[PDB]
Structure 1
Amino acid sequence: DKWEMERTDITMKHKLGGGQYGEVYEGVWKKYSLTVAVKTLKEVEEFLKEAAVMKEIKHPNLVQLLGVCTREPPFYIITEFMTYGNLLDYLRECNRQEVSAVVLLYMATQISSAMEYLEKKNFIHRDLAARNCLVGENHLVKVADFGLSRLMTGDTFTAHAGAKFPIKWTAPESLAYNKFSIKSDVWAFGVLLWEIATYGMSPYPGIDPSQVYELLEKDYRMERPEGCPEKVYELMRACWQWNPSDRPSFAEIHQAFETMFQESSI
């Protein structure tokens, strides 16, 4: 197809993000003199499914596929390079006078726009967090999308026996029953909002992940971050409803943040 590329079109450099994303490398697309990101493999069928899924993703706030090398090993998935790295590090290291309250709303609007698209197109993320959001010039935020899965919106997925999750971002139904849906992404988005409001603080600070579920089932939720608007915190708490069906859709969340962003600008 139009996606299939020669492997030699790309010059590979060093592993990006300190290796936290696995075999993902900075690279040069020589023809265009363009810095790109390249995921390689050095499981096969999982990798090639990722390549297949990425071909169908087209949204301003989801990392764009540029091409693939899927004929013979080594296999490549080639995407745009996000110059400022991930949102977690960006928030921690930023100039807060430049990255102000309106910018935080702008970033939340972008992420929710992407998540509304996945909600519309029957995709599930399963690992929404600041570390999996990527930053470009002018506070452009794109959701990392290698591991997106096909799942009709409303349907559920059961994780494998002995699967380990990032507990502090993980919905109660996922922790207890390994159940994932678009509504568990909504929960994770709530935790992501908390990350944004605190400029990249660790969720449930000082609380060991092994004790988080027990707090959640006793009705504990993180308190409102300093400087966070009441309206934004009420959205967080709505994302953290125990019952998945009680949580808002990403369509409703995006509409709320778009309104808040527009009013903050005016």
Structure 2
Amino acid sequence: DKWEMERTDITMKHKLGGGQYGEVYEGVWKKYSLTVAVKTLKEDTMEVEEFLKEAAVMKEIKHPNLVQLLGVCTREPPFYIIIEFMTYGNLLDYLRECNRQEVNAVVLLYMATQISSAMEYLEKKNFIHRDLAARNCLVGENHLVKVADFGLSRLMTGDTYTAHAGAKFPIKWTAPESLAYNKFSIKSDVWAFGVLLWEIATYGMSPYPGIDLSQVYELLEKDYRMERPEGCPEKVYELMRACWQWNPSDRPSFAEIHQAFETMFQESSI
């Protein structure tokens, strides 16, 4: 299989942290002199399946704004997934820590255009991500941003995907249909994308500030939504709101979303 490679090609450099099933390393693909990220699996989990699912999905997608699979080591432990190295780490900490004169209003629009471009691509190929959030996007030089963490991504056969009994999702990014019935779709990615914009507009605040996790769903039912963040352009808030429409099919498509950010990003560039 074309993605498989020899464990011995890679040397570990440093632990990176941030892992779910195992440590995530900064390593070096020696023959190419290339720094890479290496996601490893703790031999002692039965989460082998999910770990391998992430890898399977990354073989099937490719886009400038989706973190890129480089190869795998999966003929025996410890399992490795090898991925392009993004030097600045997660988008959430990147927003909290940045210099806002640099990461300014035009950069915010640039970040959203990047993500929506990726998500438009996924939409087109009938994929869903299911974990879109600042914490799962990755940052490179000059505010390059890529969607990452594809463990939960799926190719749908229809327009809907239903998670299995017992699955739990992060309350404040998850569409109501998904919280209530475990139904996911391109449109539930659109909801999370909306929450992701709010994260960008606030430079990484936690959403629904001070609101008890237990009461968020019920609030959504009664049409409570987050208010416009300070400094957030009116058109951007309209889109955020469109993303949070109760009915999935009232939410804009990512092509429409990308189109609107593309426009706004260009006008701001004069």
Q: CA RMSD in A?
A: 1.5
Structure 2: give runs of 5+ residues left out of the alignment: none
**How many angstroms does 1:214 deviate by?**
1.1
Contact 2:131–2:152 at 8 Å: present in 1 too? no
Shift in Å, 1:70: 1.9
CA contact (8 A) 2:41 2:78 kept: yes
Q: Structure 1, residues 195-248: CA drift from partner, whole Å, max 9, x if none?
A: 000000000001111111111111100000000010000000000000001000
Counterpart Cα distance in 2 of 1:204 and 1:189: 15
When structure 1 is superposed on structure 2, of 66-75 and 98-107 the one drifting more is 66-75
Note if contact 2:12-2:25 (Cα within 8 Å) is conserved in structure 1: yes
Measured in 1, the distance between the counterparts of 2:152 and 2:168 equals: 18
CA contact (8 A) 1:126 1:180 kept: yes
Per-residue deviation, 1:160: 2.2
Deviation at 1:153, TM superposition (A): 7.6
Task: Give 1:134 deviation, angstroms.
Answer: 0.4
Using the TM superposition, give the Cα deviation of residue 47 of structure 1 relative to its aligned residue in structure 2, in angstroms: 2.4
Instruction: Give the Cα separation in 2 of the matches to 1:152 and 1:164.
Output: 20
Q: Do the aligned residues in 1 keep the contact of 2:21 with 2:51 (CA within 8 Å)?
A: no
Report the alpha carbon displacement of residue 146 of structure 1 after superposing the two structures with TM.
2.9
Unaligned ranges ≥5, structure 1: none
Deviations 1:73-126 (A, max 9, x none): 222110011100011000000000000000000000000000001101111100
Distance change in 2, residues 1:207/1:249 (3 Å): same
How many angstroms apart in 1 are the aligned matches of 2:56 and 2:166? 27
Call closer, same or farther: CA 1:17–1:23 in 2, change over 3 Å.
closer
Deviation (angstroms), 1:3? 1.8
CA distance in 2, matches of 1:118, 1:84: 24
| Cα distance in structure 1, aligned partners of 2:153 and 2:233 | 33
User: Which stretch of the first structure deviates more once superposed, 242-251 or 51-60?
Assistant: 51-60
Q: Deviations over 1:12-51 (max 9, x none)?
A: 2443244467432221212222221111212223322322
CA distance 1:263–1:187, shift in 2 (3 Å)? same
Percent identical pairs in the alignment equals 98
Q: How many residues align?
A: 266
Matched residues in 1 for 2:229 and 2:39: separation? 36
Give the alignment of 1:104-115 within 5 angstroms: 104-115=108-119
2:78 aligned residue: 74
Task: Tell me by how many angstroms 1:148 deviates.
Answer: 4.7
- Contact 1:133/1:143 (8 A) holds in 2: yes
Give the deviation of 1:179 after TM superposition: 1.0
2:173 matches 1:150: no
CA gap of 1:22–1:236, structure 2 versus 1, over 3 A, is farther
CA distance in 1, matches of 2:17, 2:85: 11
Pick closer, same or farther for the CA change 1:18–1:76 going to 2, 3 Å: closer
Cα separation, partners in 2 of 1:158 and 1:121, compared to 1, 3 Å:
same
Greater shift, 103-112 or 47-56, is seen at: 47-56
Contact 2:22 2:41 survives alignment (8 Å): no
Residues 137/92 of structure 1: CA separation in 2 closer, same or farther (3 Å cut): same
The Cα of 1:176 is off from its aligned counterpart by 1.0
Q: Which segment drifts farther, 108-117 or 159-168?
A: 159-168
Paired residues of 1:190 and 1:236 also in contact (CA < 8 A): yes
Cα distance between partner residues in 2 of 1:103 and 1:22: 33
Q: 1:177 to 1:106 in 2, by over 3 A?
A: same
Establish whether residue 252 from structure 1 lines up as the match of residue 251 from structure 2.
no
Secondary structure at 2:227 match in 1: coil
Cα offset, 1:7, TM superposition: 0.4
Q: TM-score, normalised by structure 2?
A: 0.94
Q: Which moved more, 1:31-40 or 1:229-238?
A: 31-40
